[PDB]
Design a protein around this ligand. Structure first.
Ligand SMILES: *[C@@H]1O[C@H](CO)[C@@H](O[C@@H]2O[C@H](CO)[C@@H](O)[C@H](O)[C@H]2NC(C)=O)[C@H](O)[C@H]1NC(C)=O
Ligand SMILES: NCCc1c[nH]cn1
Ligand SMILES: NCCc1c[nH]cn1
Ligand SMILES: NCCc1c[nH]cn1
Lengths: 324, 327, 121, 327, 327, 327, 121, 121
């Protein structure tokens, strides 16, 4: 208690330690708790992380005590803190239930340990060229907002590689293949040089029944159009109905799929496959109309039988190989 | 005129009180007893894999700095006095968004005791993440937990225990989930070790069993009726090419629409759900039925009778295998 | 407005199964409780169960000996008393509780009560 | 120059005032009178089983520490003076999300009286949970309640009563629900006992009757028209295989689409609603109609006349049984 | 060096100032002049029956306690000085959710005057409820109001008036509603009496006329085209049973889909809207057209020519009656 | 030991500092230089007619009260010191909802200078309304502006200018809109006069050009394919009444579904969009195609060959006129 | 703009049914109230009812004796006075109130009033 | 960039109808105003109207005498001056205002102006 009163009284909150001198060296560590949402439509992901910041402040060094002074979140407002902000965060907030989840542990030599739990919605630029067989890389940039490299210098702590916890994360749709901690000291903004600690992790979309939902109904519509080939040409309403219904269902699927996806003017691989499927179903109706016009035959229909799956099998192999 | 005497006693307690220091700072850890009075579980979201919980969170601990004598009563003070008192830094590890109700005032209770015991109650609405295994969906059983842990103080400074043993958590019967039933709840006390240190942990877990009544009417029954509808084409004469072809197409298209609707209500998980298996099986039968007439039409330009017995028998066999496997 | 009728008591030296039939606005009162009152002693909570979900609670004295279950078809809540002991000599009551009426263990939180059945061993 | 005299009087009242202590602390409980002036009920959500309520919540109690003499007027002070005064810890037990309006200032009123009576009013918009029984939906009647209770002070320290008897709650006629009508409202006062103690409780309940006008046009009428549409196939000649088969299929498919839309607007309850029973019955008639032609087609390769009288008669009988049962 | 002199003057004004007491406390009521500078009306929601309004709310009143001499200037102080000054407890009675913008600082203005006049401006975005009569929808005209009232002070303590008469509210021309047009706005001053007392009231009302251009293309035109499409079956030969039956069915099914979409965008009101009447009438014509062929098919196993003139004539007559009634 | 000397200097500056008074109060207006560092434009919503903007808003002004000597350095103070300093009341006139990020601390920067120059930076995410002209949609070009203005201080007390001329706003190249491209941005400085007075105004405007790539695939291509699909009926023999009628109906129904989907994604504007004109034209062709067979069927109970050349030629002519007009 | 016409008074020694017909912008004024004014005494609130929902309120003096109901087809609000007593000797008025015009019991909150019908017993 | 041309002035002793044709980016300037400037006197606001919605405002001097309406087909705003008085002897101008340019009554808030028409009575 006597230490706490003495330290605050002679403490100047508005100034970084050693102002007008060497920059403050701040050790930074991350403990990712979870990655809740990954929305391609909003180009964002939500992450909950324990942010640990360590720095030395000689103004808070005490004597005669060799025990670290664990302190509550109330003591936070009494001390100078780094102005670390997430560069690419759309929105973020602190958990305050039941109290502000802030940790301050003070050591006799003046080393301060500052840990807070934060949930942040971070914007991630995603390329949907190979969607859904696409791998995305998302960053997490940390930087001082007001203090340049002359005042605050950031660096990953030695314990970062052991407490990141990215291996333990479980994602419903993606999988964390690789992660990397990058330090960029060359973020020269207008105010000055700003050191930027960045966390890069690569996300691979799971290829399971999700892609089966998108592709199989499209394939089955194409297969349904092939049924008209085995149907007799004299059954004009039967083959016409099969042609029109398959084409309409394919058209609705293409429109619905894009609508339930971001409005980006990007040629997604799913859209390409839909176009290929639409050509086959449309051509089948054209083929029967050509056959009916000629009648106004059976060998032509048999020739159309072997060609369409053979062409469809070949185009599927090219499609899957290109995007895999 | 005891109010003045009580005011003097309370002012004496808070004179020199340091909220920055825990009780018995530098000595034995302070034991905190916790009880939960569950109010309701508002929502259980499979897409977001989380549930909303409203409860009365109460903390019990003894602070000798607040001990008073001469007043044989339990002082129930205003909730605003908690700002001048030390409280445990209790937080929920698996929560996603939580808040404390503040109408008409903050839902907070402080009740001191002559021996120094402090009662701290909060009405908290929390959204806690709960990973769900949807392999057996909708016939699945889920285990959602609520992790309680201190944030700053390690096991050397604070300890957590369920006050009252297995009776610490009450109000479980108040939970009325239209889609789930509370099979069982458990109380777990453990110590979790991190890089900073070892922290006390209290875990409250519920085992939820999903109700199949809604899904039978919503999904299973329409799929069966469509499959039976495709069988009608067998009794239709083969010369009616337009009718039988239309019957096969419409059943296939309807099956796709049902399949699309179900998967939109669920998260984009890669593995195949139990309900997905049933829909895929139903799609096979209707697709084969349309292929059956194509074979009949091709040979024509007896088979229908053979199909009239195989398809209902195979579908009945498929249903028996499906239900027994998942029950 | 809920009406409660209970039956199945009598005198035995054993296993006994009490029952309680409910009728009325059962939705407003989804919790059914069982209480017993020894002569001179205050009414004692025995066990409670919800109409929906089958969640149940029991007292320490009757734990692992009395089982409570209900069937919504008959709107009946039945208490199965096994390994009867001379301590179980009291009038058994059937009660219903509101949705926001508080704890189960307190009889005053219940609105509608049954006439009572006498069980003596 | 009475403003200076009033300022001296008010400063005298607040000098030594302890907000942490309730009036008559350690003595008889303080009685709090409560009146509610309902503004409107914005929404009634069946999916979330809750309603949004806006009201003027007013609390009446006497604090002798605030009694003043020499001023024969009721001092209407600024709303910011409430922070220096003790107020009851009144909270709503069944609320889900509530707030106090703060434009252009906090919607709060303080009005002292010479005898020490304090009037405290708040304009509160609250979302209170209301479990709904949808077995008779949409012909159901709902009873939504608003629970008012003290959080920290037990019955030994505070008491709640409806000020004015049955006239405590006003503005019920202002409620304009497009889907519901306020049949009746009741005021209930009771004591609820918890582990911590017994707390006073005030309950305000409304009985809501759903309006059937919207659902007749939205759901019932389209289903009837589809069922009548299927009967047209009976008058069509049996040789028109394509037409009659198409008529049966489209009616069945349309019935499924109507059924899917209705259930999406309602929570995933396991039990069967009254509207679900009607949709299932309509689906049976159209399905039997398509099966009727399949039997006709099979025997051909009189029955239609017998179907022309049975189906309209059976459907009319089904409607009479359905409506009488639920009315 | 007048800044020091101004600082001394301002500190003198705030020395002994009591924010808890209104100007001329215990005497004549203080008159408050109010002007509104409308910025925009963001949304007008029929489902929620409310509109979003952004405006510059300015209040004018005189406080002799803030009168200063020797400075022939209007002191434009920082917005943070409003916390040390008394302000009227003005609130909006019919609002649902309102807030004051705070970027980059709170959108607040304080401008004192030598005679004691105080100007208080706020940029407020408010969502005010507006009950709508949808009987004539979409050809309806709506009257949405904005109620302004004091919360705590009665008419004996405060009075409200529109500063500038009918010119108090400006910026009405800035309102650009894609679906509505501001026909007229009115300013109403009245006193409303409650149980607590009589309170001054200022009302601002707009009469909105809905634009029919969107609904003609979205709803009316597709319905007409479907009705005309059903008439094509009359020219088709009766022997084409499959074609004429398919034409009648598809038009009926399409009419149902259009009807379902419209009602989903509107609140579940029980009464029949004008647009609903048109959709019901269109459904009758297409349903009769399919019934017309059923009669033709029945008698066959001239009528078409009679139907070719009755249906277009009756539909044209129906349109003429419908439009004249609602215009 | 310069930290103590710096602390003494800073305390001297804030001793007697009055935040309520602007620099050079009562004298010449204070010039404020503003530069914007755009981070990204998250969304551009046509339905709400607004865009979301994230930027680094920096303000430059000189306050002689904060001038210090003896320290040849620029003091970068904590962001919490801004509460004890006067800052301009800068607000955005056309914003709808804005906030300042506060993780891990408030995104605020204060950097004093020896001559009294003060640098004030904020990271602000704002939603600014932008009225859009959708007559040429989706081939339209939009001009969205960001209005910057002082709220309380008039031109006699404060002046705004773009610091650095046309280089004041940077980061325009960072904007990555999937649907739009930043054609040009402009900086405008003007004075706007209101009833209270004349206020300085800074305007930042972007001219956005919509990308047509998405809409060609989403809307234009499906409509063309349906129109081509209707032409297939011409080659089909006239005796196939069921097939040709079904072809005409399905194309018409599909065209309606496409039209409904497009208009749901756009605000209910009364005027006709360019995309609406194309959809209406496509609907005419398919409707005429079905009417074409009705004429053929009527005369039968050569025309097809004439239709095989007129329809593709007319549709090609329609496309050429449509694209040239809107490009 | 709402016009109110009331009729059905007269003199009796009994049961009487008053009536009130409304026309105009009834939507803006969904609440109809009944008032009576004794000679010399201030106008007294009798009862109020909403056009939609049929919710009604009554004064203590006329409680359990007077019933108020309306039919939207005729836009008519009718007051049924039963068990008439000599205290019920006053001119009965018909009034309409705005949506946000405040309490029912205060006549000054009503904008449009009827001419008045004389009922004497 | 909006170009404004006005015509229809002349000298009369009466009713006169001014007109103003606009061309360019009219969407950015949805508000059209009319101003007159007496010799020696400052330019005076007459009336303003929006392109969409037809909402209009007038000065007190010209209230109930001058009517302003526009047609979007011709992109023309016309001022109808009736009951002309000798006070109405000034050059009439046509102006356009931006969406966020402030109040109507202040000419300095308008960006584009017409050449001017002389009306003398
Ligand atoms: C301070 O503000 C007041 C109120 O706006 C100003 O008084 C007005 O002055 C104008 C002329 O500038 C007159 O047309 C108004 O009639 C005045 N109103 C009142 C109520 O007196 C005053 O001029 C302003 N002071 C300064 C120095 O600008
Ligand atoms: N006032 C509610 C107190 C409570 C609820 N649960 C336990 N204690
Ligand atoms: N200012 C309105 C106060 C009120 C409403 N209801 C009762 N009192
Ligand atoms: N600073 C602009 C203040 C304002 C807008 N409207 C009226 N006054």
């Amino acid at each position: 208690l006597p230490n706490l009163d003495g330290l605050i009284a002679g403490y100047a909150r508005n100034f970084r330690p050693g102002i007008g001198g060497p920059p403050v060296n701040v050790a930074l560590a991350l403990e990712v708790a979870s990655i809740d949402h990954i929305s391609e439509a909003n180009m964002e992901y939500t992450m909950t992380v324990f942010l640990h910041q360590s720095w030395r402040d000689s103004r808070l060094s005490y004597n005669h005590t060799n025990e670290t002074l664990g302190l509550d979140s109330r003591f936070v407002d009494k001390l100078w803190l780094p102005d670390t902000f997430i560069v690419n965060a759309k929105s973020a907030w602190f958990h305050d239930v039941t109290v502000e989840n802030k940790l301050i542990r003070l050591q006799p030599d003046g080393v301060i340990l500052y840990s807070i739990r934060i949930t942040s919605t971070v914007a991630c630029d995603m390329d949907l060229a190979k969607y859904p067989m696409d791998e995305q890389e998302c960053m997490l940039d940390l930087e001082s907002y007001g203090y340049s490299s002359e005042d605050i210098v950031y660096y990953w702590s030695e314990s970062q590689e052991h407490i990141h916890g990215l291996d333990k994360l479980q994602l419903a749709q993606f999988t964390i293949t690789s992660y990397r901690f990058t330090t960029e000291l060359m973020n020269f903004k207008s105010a000055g040089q700003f050191p930027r600690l960045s966390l890069h992790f690569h996300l691979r979309r799971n290829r399971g029944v999700y892609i089966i939902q998108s592709y199989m109904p499209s394939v089955l519509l194409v297969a349904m159009s092939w049924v008209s080939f085995w149907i007799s040409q004299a059954a004009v309403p039967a083959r016409v109905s099969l042609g029109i219904t398959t084409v309409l269902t394919m058209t609705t699927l293409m429109v619905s799929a894009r609508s339930s996806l971001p409005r980006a003017s990007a040629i997604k691989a799913l859209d390409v496959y839909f176009w290929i499927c639409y050509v086959f179903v449309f051509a089948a109706l054209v083929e029967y109309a050509f056959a009916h016009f000629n009648a106004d035959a059976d060998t032509i229909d048999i020739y159309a039988r072997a060609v369409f799956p053979a062409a469809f099998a070949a185009v599927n192999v090219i499609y899957w190989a290109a995007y895999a | 005129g005891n109010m003045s005497f009580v005011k003097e006693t309370v002012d004496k307690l808070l004179k020199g009180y340091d909220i920055r220091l825990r009780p018995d700072f530098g000595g034995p850890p302070v034991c905190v007893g916790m009880n939960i009075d569950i109010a309701s579980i508002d929502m259980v979201s499979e897409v977001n894999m989380d549930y909303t919980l409203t409860m009365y969170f109460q903390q019990y601990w003894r602070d000798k700095r607040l001990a008073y004598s001469g007043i044989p009563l339990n002082l129930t003070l205003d909730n605003r006095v908690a700002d001048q008192l030390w409280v445990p830094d209790t937080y929920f590890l698996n929560d996603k968004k939580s808040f404390v109700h503040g109408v008409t005032v903050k839902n907070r209770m402080i009740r001191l005791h002559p021996d120094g015991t402090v009662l701290y109650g909060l009405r908290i609405t929390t959204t806690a993440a709960c990973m769900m295994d949807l392999r057996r969906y909708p016939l699945d059983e889920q285990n959602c937990t609520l992790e309680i842990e201190s944030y700053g103080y390690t096991t050397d400074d604070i300890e957590f225990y369920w006050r009252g043993g297995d009776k610490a958590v009450t109000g479980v019967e108040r939970i009325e989930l239209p889609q789930f039933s509370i099979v069982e709840h458990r109380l777990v006390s453990r110590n979790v070790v991190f890089a900073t240190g070892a922290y006390p942990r209290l875990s409250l877990s519920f085992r939820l069993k999903r109700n199949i009544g809604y899904f039978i009417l919503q999904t299973y029954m329409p799929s069966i009726l469509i499959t039976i509808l495709s069988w009608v084409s067998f009794w239709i004469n083969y010369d009616a090419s337009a009718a039988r072809v239309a019957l096969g197409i419409t059943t296939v298209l309807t099956m796709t629409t049902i399949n699309t609707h179900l998967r939109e209500t669920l998260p984009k998980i890669p593995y195949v759900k139990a309900i997905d298996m049933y829909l895929m099986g139903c799609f096979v039968f209707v697709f084969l039925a349309l292929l059956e007439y194509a074979f009949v039409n091709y040979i024509f330009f007896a088979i229908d009778r053979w199909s009239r017995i195989v398809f209902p028998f195979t579908f009945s066999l498929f249903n028996l295998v499906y239900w027994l496997y998942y029950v | 407005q809920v009406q409660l009728v209970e039956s199945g008591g009598g005198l035995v030296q054993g296993s006994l199964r009490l029952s309680c039939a409910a009728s009325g606005h059962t939705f407003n009162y989804p919790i059914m409780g069982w209480f017993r009152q020894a002569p001179g002693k205050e009414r004692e909570f025995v066990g409670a169960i919800s109409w929906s979900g089958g969640s149940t609670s029991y007292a320490d004295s009757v734990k692992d000996r009395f089982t409570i279950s209900r069937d919504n078809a008959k709107n009946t809540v039945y208490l199965e008393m096994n390994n009867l002991k001379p301590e179980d000599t009291a009038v058994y009551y059937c009660a219903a509780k509101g949705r926001y009426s508080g704890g189960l263990y307190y009889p005053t939180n219940y609105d509608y009560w049954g006439q009572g059945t006498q069980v003596t061993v």
